[PDB]
Assembly symmetry: D2
Homo-oligomer: 404 residues x 4
């Protein structure tokens, strides 16, 4: 069937993931912050753990797309490579004296190796002996100063693109360095076979424009069903983006309502404090969720900009309940800073009441089980060494609707 995500809990048929790899190999305690990644991880173990995650979904018949594979195949079309390289390798990003050598060398590589470098970055050392490479090597040695920076956050495929019903967003990331990730995913959606001939809409976003203060991040976006879309507004998703995203969905009739979850204020996305596990069940970080201010945004013909907004009176949990035609949501609280502390938010639902979470979250997983949910677990030693879990590491593409 047609590409599209119709809820948070419906049967998952196709999802995109990206395994840890070269990017993470380039991590050092000293370059972590600038690479916008929490810490250094045991790469090979992380790979085995991500593989076990991938294997567990596949064994239940889910089609799991891995970003490195998709990129490797996209890149085999001369036009797609050209499209990425034209944007990725310029004087402004690489430098005058390196664009030509860097591109010639990249272009000579085998498909899979080239894809690993596009995601894992390129160091002066990878280049064949050259003056340019040499000057860079000097700045590193003499000044402590990558031609192409590694993109360790690709592992979190939820961040950069969002499938909302019969369409996708190409999210204008908060940190400029992360726009490199949205660039490669866009190349995939543009040129790859799984996408090029498939019907779907591009609701918002474009790697070729600036967006300025308009920013959107995957963790904040959820098409919950019933023509509704939840979008968290906080440190990473701005009102400027959300409005344009809503106007676009409305203009095409793709949605009836967009519920803006206003987060109070440490950057956090909606999915790190709120997640679905079943038709009427959710985990929650009580501390934030009870302070969320819900705003309803609806299509309005008598308005210049074509929509109107209303702050909702009830709590966010009541607003979401009613929007799904539910009397109330069953809620499992987690996080908070009872053997020990744990934060079981951010699990990824495979189908109603079937979830994948982390092994460490024993208390919370026990509550989810007691609440009727089957919890499949994977190791978090390296994958969840910092932020995000299953939800963060998956980008749903085809997920069936649920109901009223």
């Amino acid at each position: 069937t047609k590409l599209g995500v119709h809820s948070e809990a419906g049967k998952l048929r196709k999802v995109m993931v990206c395994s840890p790899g070269l990017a993470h190999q380039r991590l050092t305690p000293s370059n972590c912050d600038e690479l916008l990644f929490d810490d250094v991880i045991w790469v090979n173990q992380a790979k085995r753990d991500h593989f076990d995650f991938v294997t567990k979904m596949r064994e239940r018949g889910i089609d799991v797309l891995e970003m490195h594979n998709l990129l490797t195949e996209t890149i085999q079309n001369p036009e797609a490579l050209k499209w990425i390289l034209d944007r990725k390798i310029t004087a402004d990003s690489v430098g005058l004296g390196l664009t030509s050598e860097l591109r010639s060398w990249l272009e000579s590589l085998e498909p899979r190796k080239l894809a690993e470098y596009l995601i894992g970055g390129v160091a002066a050392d990878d280049l064949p002996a050259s003056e340019g490479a040499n000057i860079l090597k000097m700045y590193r040695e003499y000044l402590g100063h990558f031609l192409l920076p590694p993109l360790p956050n690709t592992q979190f495929t939820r961040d950069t693109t969002c499938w909302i019903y019969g369409g996708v967003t190409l999210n204008p990331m908060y940190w400029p360095a992360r726009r490199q990730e949205t660039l490669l995913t866009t190349a995939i959606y543009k040129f790859h076979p799984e996408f090029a001939n498939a019907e779907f809409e591009i609701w918002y976003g474009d790697p070729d424009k600036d967006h300025g203060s308009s920013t959107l991040e995957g963790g904040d976006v959820m098409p919950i069903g019933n023509g509704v879309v939840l979008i968290g507004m906080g440190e990473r998703s701005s009102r400027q983006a959300i409005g344009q995203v809503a106007q676009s969905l409305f203009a095409k009739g793709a949605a009836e309502r967009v519920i803006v979850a206003g987060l109070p204020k440490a950057a956090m996305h909606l999915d790190t404090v709120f997640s679905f596990c079943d038709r009427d069940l959710v985990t929650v970080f009580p501390e934030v969720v009870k302070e969320i201010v819900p705003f309803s945004l609806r299509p309005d013909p008598s308005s210049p900009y074509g929509m109107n907004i209303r702050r909702e009176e009830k709590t966010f949990l009541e607003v979401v309940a009613e929007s799904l035609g539910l009397k109330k949501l069953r809620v499992v609280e987690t996080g908070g800073n009872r053997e020990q502390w744990d934060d079981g938010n951010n699990v990824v639902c495979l189908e109603p009441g079937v979830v994948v979470g982390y092994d460490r979250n024993t208390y919370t997983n026990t509550l989810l089980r007691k609440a009727g949910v089957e919890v499949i677990t994977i190791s978090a030693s390296e994958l969840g060494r910092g932020r995000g879990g299953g939800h963060c590491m998956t980008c749903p593409i085809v997920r069936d609707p649920i109901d009223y």
Copy 2:
């Protein structure tokens, strides 16, 4: 005389500064960091000190242009306002439901008031009452969201940051923080439509507000046309190799320079003018800790190269290199800053701005360095640092030389 800056110590004939103002009135201990500014300052007092600074240069014959004055004049030209608002007010910057009412209110303001708002930002409260404006207030009240439709630009006070005149050409610098590009947009509008500039002859070496410069960044404090065909450019956290190379290549292309000395700063973000400053023909202040570690690189034009230049690491200290580049046996050097060290109190006397050889404007508080500067032969005019130097300020950061005579 033709626009252009030909040294660091020559006679300053014309300069741009910008007085602290509405932008600073909006500072708060909690929005400080996000507005890239060190701390809340007493604005009315800052203004009085800024005016004393301006008055002390003007009194000496120097033409001193106030950015607020220039901008108020500029925006009286309809095409220039439009050019500015087309780029500053959009659905991406302001939101779909605020663009028209905000643009209409601005265009209905008196020139002076309009210019104060362009530099000082616009809060939801400043608009005439309305639906769109009420929701922003609600975001600020119920969520604690910043209420600025148009963010304030308190850093405008440091006119040195966004544009550098290098020998009769200027650079419209691509700042490190995207927010600060809003300053360059306004300074560029002035250089473009204002009488003092639109009709003058000069080159635009590098830069452009309509383009995204990616990883190519350049900040004023790092640029120094020391003369004798040479240009010093610091390379550290704020000025990247990617920018420096294109600036040089552009300068070489028109023969405006013979050499670019890349001052390689090791590693807290700091510009060259923050640890190194000229006071006279052969005299400089220095923060030893950083300077003794700067790695120098000579960048010269070279026809036998695909990209037109060559680069050579220098084996002698950065100080010996600057010396040799200016035809001197040795630079006289005054040490300052230290965070450790002989003397009554710690102080940092770097960043004075030179008015003429041996005449400098400095801060009243740096009593030690100021007297070591006097003993070394310099007349030091002082201004109050209580508010202006409440952080990384300095007379050098607060001035953008437009016309400065050469030396020798």
Copy 3:
């Protein structure tokens, strides 16, 4: 009359202050944090500003005691010097190979110079040529590593000792390095003429004991009158200290009630968010004060520990109002992160409606004036370059009561 502080707004007759000096001269951007001081200041200007502050109170007949003078005179009694030096110079603080030279040299100095070193610290460089001094000089040069550390916070005389009615507390400071300040002030209260023969009680504290988790800081303590004492409980004043302080005051009948202002949670003392200006007027940082939880602590004969505690129902501002027999307090709000922002809290009251504040706080000072208060101002360029104002820089010793 007898030493003692009977309110926050009564006529101030005797106060102790301490001018900026050698301690501040030893400040560098790199040693500020470890010296527990906010920033480097223009010492000579700070001195002129502190002098202008001192002069303004004296001109209104207030007896202003300056710590350097008191110390200089105390130190002229052989027994007082010995008492301080025995505690200040030990193997554990100075090192085995330096105690003897350091003490001999200090002991040879003239009274005033010796007092300046006891407060301003001693550097290896001040010592006469020696091997010891030399090894220290080596560690500084070769390793970036003061014999006696400077005490730049002495300028804030309110921090270390508190006069509560007919007695004083010798506060067990939070940061161990600051206990050096309480040591010198205790020597003054013990041996100096102004204190040695004066009648007063030592309610709590002792520089010769440990106190562990018991900590108290001046900014949190206020004897407001009517037998009541307000004591803020937050990051710097602990329940362990407050209880012992209350039990002592009760045991001597020095107070009828102690109102614990419970501060929510960046360390803050009560006086930085709450201050008196007149019999019924106070400035306030609304953000904190409205969240303060008031607890009343009273003498109770039927209890093992001799007191009982009750959380109060009403706001803290209503609780304080009633405890003074006032219908309500008039309140001037300030701070908050209207030309510009300012935080006018922490002014020091000289008499009802007569206050000393900082020149920069124009908005707030204007409100205080409109509220009937005469505001004398001093420069804050260096004195209030960071925390505290007039209140923080004064330690009241004799202040008359006010009324019902």
Copy 4:
């Protein structure tokens, strides 16, 4: 055999470790920092890995003492419990209105449970209901105050920190953070009343829980009795000259050492064992960046001195000095850590604990360093670092050698 540690690589005969436990169950992202611990760990898994660590040493004949076991045994002695509670429960530490009920509840517990609480802390909730306990809950609820009557001591896991056996004598270290002195109090109680110790012969070189040590601080990770009469002691943010001098003077007074090499760490707090570790007679791991900058100082006893010792800065590298002090031409060296640098992934293999010459216990994750250690001749037994090494851990920090044979 007599208690005492005579080298870093000799055969380990007896060691103390402490398993993660209740203390860690109380960790939270917001109380982490205040409890001086890097992050929240999965406690049950940490315990399983700790046990694998313990089991791997025991299986080799090593007597491994578990601090929880030792403490449970100790407190069965009435005089030892009293000694401990007299010092741990007071009006200053717990508050006037909680001392008696808290002391009574503790004394009513079963030994094992009591010991878990002494190391793991006590929350208001653990007490039988009462007035005093309810007010603490109220402080925690209405004010967000920590609810710990007795703070937890998650750092107990690093038995290396609080006490060092140096040649048949031990140091009861005065920690940098006052909170951590509560660990030393408990370890001292064990060394004092426990059978394995009360009756053994050994010296107490330095330290004492009943005294305030002012600015004199010493941390385990900095101490290393490398043998041949020599002792290495790192001097940086955690071990001060004031302590080091008295430790040396005490060692010299009884002739337990001929020399103390002060390893001067430049300048993030770090102990010597964190950047430098022995693996064999002549082999050490090293974090170059720090090691190449350590300034060595030799401290020898000297009768012609008022304070009994002399100090001399060494002109050769710290590595050449350690070499010469052990009768070697050169130490074989394996580099690790770097935060920059040739190899598949970054790792830091410092802090392995040696069981015998060339036999070491390390972490599974440090694959690069581990194989460079094997190529250099070392058998590397590995344990899981997911929870235990979730920060500054390491096998060396997790062991407090009691009996270790000399080498040569």
